[PDB]
Amino acid sequence: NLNATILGQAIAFVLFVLFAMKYVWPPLMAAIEKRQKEIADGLASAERAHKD
Amino acid sequence: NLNATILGQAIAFVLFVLFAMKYVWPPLMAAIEKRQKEIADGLASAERAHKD
Amino acid sequence: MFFSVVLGLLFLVLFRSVAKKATSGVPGKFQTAIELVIGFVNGSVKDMYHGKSKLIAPLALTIFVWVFLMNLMDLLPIDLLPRVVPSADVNVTLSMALGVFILILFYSIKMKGIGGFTKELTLQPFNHWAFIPVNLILEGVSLLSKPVSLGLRLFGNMYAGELIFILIAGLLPWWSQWILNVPWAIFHILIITLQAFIFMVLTIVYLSMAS
Amino acid sequence: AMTYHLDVVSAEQQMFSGLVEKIQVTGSEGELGIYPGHAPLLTAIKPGMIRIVKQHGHEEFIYLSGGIL
Amino acid sequence: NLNMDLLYMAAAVMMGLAAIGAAIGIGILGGKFLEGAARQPDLIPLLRTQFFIVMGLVDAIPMIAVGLGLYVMFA
Amino acid sequence: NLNMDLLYMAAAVMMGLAAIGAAIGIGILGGKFLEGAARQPDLIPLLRTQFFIVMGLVDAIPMIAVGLGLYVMFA
Amino acid sequence: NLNMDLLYMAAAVMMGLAAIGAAIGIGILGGKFLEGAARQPDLIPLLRTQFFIVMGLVDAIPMIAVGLGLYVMFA
Amino acid sequence: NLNMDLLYMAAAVMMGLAAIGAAIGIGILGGKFLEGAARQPDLIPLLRTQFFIVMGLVDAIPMIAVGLGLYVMFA
Amino acid sequence: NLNMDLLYMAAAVMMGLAAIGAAIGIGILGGKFLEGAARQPDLIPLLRTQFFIVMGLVDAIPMIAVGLGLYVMFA
Amino acid sequence: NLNMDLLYMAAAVMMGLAAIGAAIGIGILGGKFLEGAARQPDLIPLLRTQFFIVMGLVDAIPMIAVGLGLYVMFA
Amino acid sequence: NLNMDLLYMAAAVMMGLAAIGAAIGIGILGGKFLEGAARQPDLIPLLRTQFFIVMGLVDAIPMIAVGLGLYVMFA
Amino acid sequence: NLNMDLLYMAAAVMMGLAAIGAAIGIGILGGKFLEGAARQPDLIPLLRTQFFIVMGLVDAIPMIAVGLGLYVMFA
Amino acid sequence: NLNMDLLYMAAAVMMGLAAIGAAIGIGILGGKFLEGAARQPDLIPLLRTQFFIVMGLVDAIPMIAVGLGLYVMFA
Amino acid sequence: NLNMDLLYMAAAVMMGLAAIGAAIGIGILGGKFLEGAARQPDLIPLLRTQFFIVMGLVDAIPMIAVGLGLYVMFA
């Protein structure tokens, strides 16, 4: 950290964040969204079928 | 006078590995099958329901 | 500089590790109990998320996700108990990027919402109420600091306490006790990371709620 | 022991009565010191038998159904 | 001189600050006696002796402090 | 000089800090008297004498502190 | 010089710290008066005189502290 | 120098620590006013004047401390 | 040097310790406001102004302490 | 040296002792929020904002103490 | 001389201030005994032994303080 | 030497005394959580998060004190 | 001499003042045990073990203070 | 010598006074556990874990104070 070392130290964390934003957020946000809409979906179809 | 740390950490890792793995594992699995088996079970029985 | 750049490197290793494991993971599998915990984490995260409601919502989810996710980073060092500067400016790294990012997101609700558009008027009659404009001006000052101030204060606070448990574990001639405390210290660590995500959702409720 | 005009009433008809210097029971709050000289207060009690010093040292435990006093 | 100065400072320290604990504690007890008797007047002869016992035990802690104070002043 | 300086510092220490305990304790008692009489007005002549006894016992702890203060100032 | 310096330090010590006890104690009493009157409004003329007596007794403990302070400053 | 240094230390001591007693005591009273009015809203015009009297008496104890502080700073 | 050292020590003493009294007292008041409104929600617009008055009076006691602190640091 | 030593002692004094008042006061408020919501759950969105306001006002008193501490350390 | 002066100052410090905790704590317990017996008189022989146990455990903390005081005075 | 001695004394002062405020304040909050849940068990998932928020805010005041302590020891 | 004098002063400081916290805390617990058993006598064998656990944890904090005191006196 | 003397005084200061906060705070929590279980016995397995969490968080504040004490004594 004599110079620029601790600097890049925090920099690392920030970068991982952004990388999560572009790709991760799109693929994974939709990914947990996919299980949600999945169990959610099947359960939904369930209910409707029974009621009607 | 002896190093003596990793021994206690290891035994605690044994008994506690058991207690912890045991405690969480059954609940989380029953949550898995609870979920898949949930949206699922409803959908299927409801399919029998609608069809019939 | 070379010295204690190694610690920055460790911080890099952990942070990027989380970052990639993310998009790796969504495709598969994840686990038999995998779907379950995916549910508890994602969903509960959403429940607390409002909280905010909707401002950061996709990036909010991704965000607190990376908070605990990447937050396992220094949590490794507590387990190390059971050179001499691998985690130092990595802990300082996390602290720094932490408080910094806090003030940053405040700016996100500031430009993206009003927010800072409203904050241009946040001087407000609150500055006149309170006839002296420094009433609202000053209140807002202590606040704006306090977001990154408490944010990083807790950030390097936790990083530090981790370090203390570590060295305590390091200096003992008969070290079985270090094994004993390492468990307690570790529990403390988990408390820290989850509490970090907690700070996230707090700033969220604040954020989509206000500004 | 007689003190303070201790009566026992019920809907259809009064349960009992007397003067009980001491009423030994545990209030729905808790252990209730059998006393003459307690202040204006409101109470209720679950079913059960409460010995009481009632008129002339006559202390008796009397089962209850639950009720208010 | 230095030893004598230390005695007088020490006497002030041990006398005043510790005696605050009974000044408060004697009062806490009498407040309990007053509130207990107000709630249930028939319990007065039972709890008054308890209040005296309790006041004397609380007052003994300062009397210890005062004892050290007097030792420093006069012993 | 050093002994005289120590007397004046010691007098300040023992006088002020310990007397806080009755300043609080005398008030605790009167608050109990007021609350007890508000809850049950008929118990006033029973508990007023208790309040006086109790106030005087609490006030005696500071009077001890004040006594040491005056000894340091004038003895 | 040393004796004069000791007087000014001693005056600060005895004046401020002990007077905290009535700052709290006067307030404890008025809180009891307000709560007692809110619970039972008809008891106001009975307990208001008690509050005044009690406030003055609590205020006398600091006035003792202040007295020692003024002696140190001006005597 | 020593006398001037003693004045500035004494001013800090007497100003800050004693004033804590009203910071707490003024708040104790307003908490009693708020709780008393919440329990019985019709008693508001009766107990509000009591709260003001009581706050001013509690605030006078620090104003004594502040007075000694200002004497040490400027007298 | 000695006078300057005394200023910096005195500033620390008067700033921190006295300000604890409002840190506690402002909180005491808001706890009374929250508990009073929870018990009786219709009394909110009546007691909220009381809480503000009371918080400001409690906060003025530290602002006095802070004032002496700043005088010692900068005057 | 003497001035620098006085800065470091003064920083310790003003930082730690005054900050105890909010450590207690922030907790007093959250205890009132928890107890008020437990007694009446429907009043949660009304009193939660009050708790935040009140916590921030209590936290400002230590932040004043911390400010003086940092001035002594770094100004 | 310096070591002897330090003993007498240390004896005053350890004797008085710590003993305030039981002066208060012994009183807290007896107030609980009096209030518990006033509310439920039949529970007297059950809770009186608890009060004695508890008073002795609280009194042991000062007796530790007094022990250090006597070591400093006479050991 | 004098500056180093002042650092070690200052570290002790700022570390210990201020941290008492959260030691008390963290406990005040958990006592409110326990009492609130005992009175109304269905409110547990609502007030547990409040307790965590509140404990962390109270714990931050000592962490400030500890921070100044560590600066004095190691900075 | 100076190091030995510092040991004896330090022993007095760490022994007495910190031990006040359990003197109060052990008493707080026993007061809760007595009040809980008075309100509900059937809960005695459930809460008595809790009181013992809790008293021992509170007593451990002073035993830490006493440990440092004895190290300073004899180590 | 001066640095070593400062270490021993600093160790006494940071060890004892701050640890009073948990001595009180651990007791506050156990009193809440005992009172909550006495009022509602069925809630025992729900609130006992809360009491343990809360006691450990309160005990961590002194352990910080003790840590600084041990650093001053042995580091």
Residue numbers in the entry:
A (entry chain I), B (entry chain J): 2 to 53
C (entry chain K): 46 to 127, 140 to 268
D (entry chain H): 1 to 69
E (entry chain O), F (entry chain N), G (entry chain M), H (entry chain V), I (entry chain U), J (entry chain T), ...: 3 to 77
What does the paper say about this structure?
In most cells, the bulk of ATP, the principal source of cellular energy, is synthesized by ATP synthase. This molecular generator couples ion flow across membranes with the addition of inorganic phosphate (Pi) to ADP thereby generating ATP. Like the analogous complexes in other kingdoms, it is based on two reversible motors, termed F1 and Fo, connected by central and peripheral stalks.
(A–B) Cryo-EM maps shown as surface representation, states 1, 2 and 3, respectively, resulting from rotation of the central stalk by 120°. Three of the four classes containing 104,510 (State 1), 67,829 (State 2) and 53,587 (State 3) particles were movie-refined and post-processed in RELION producing maps at 7.4, 7.8, 8.5 Å, respectively. In all three rotational states of the E. coli F-ATPase, the εCTD had an extended conformation, albeit with a different proportion of particles observed at each state (46%, 30% and 24%), suggesting State one to be the lowest energy. In all three reconstructions, the εCTD is in an extended conformation, stabilizing an overall F1 motor conformation similar to that seen in the thermophilic Bacillus PS3 F1 ATPase structure. All three reconstructions showed the complex in its autoinhibited state, with clear density for the εCTD extending deep into the central cavity of the F1 enzyme. The cryo-EM maps resembled the ‘open, closed, open’ conformation as seen in the Bacillus PS3 F1 crystal structure, despite different nucleotide binding positions. While the overall density of the c-ring was relatively weak, 10 peaks of density were clearly present when viewed from above, confirming the stoichiometry of the c-ring to be decameric in E. coli F-ATPase.
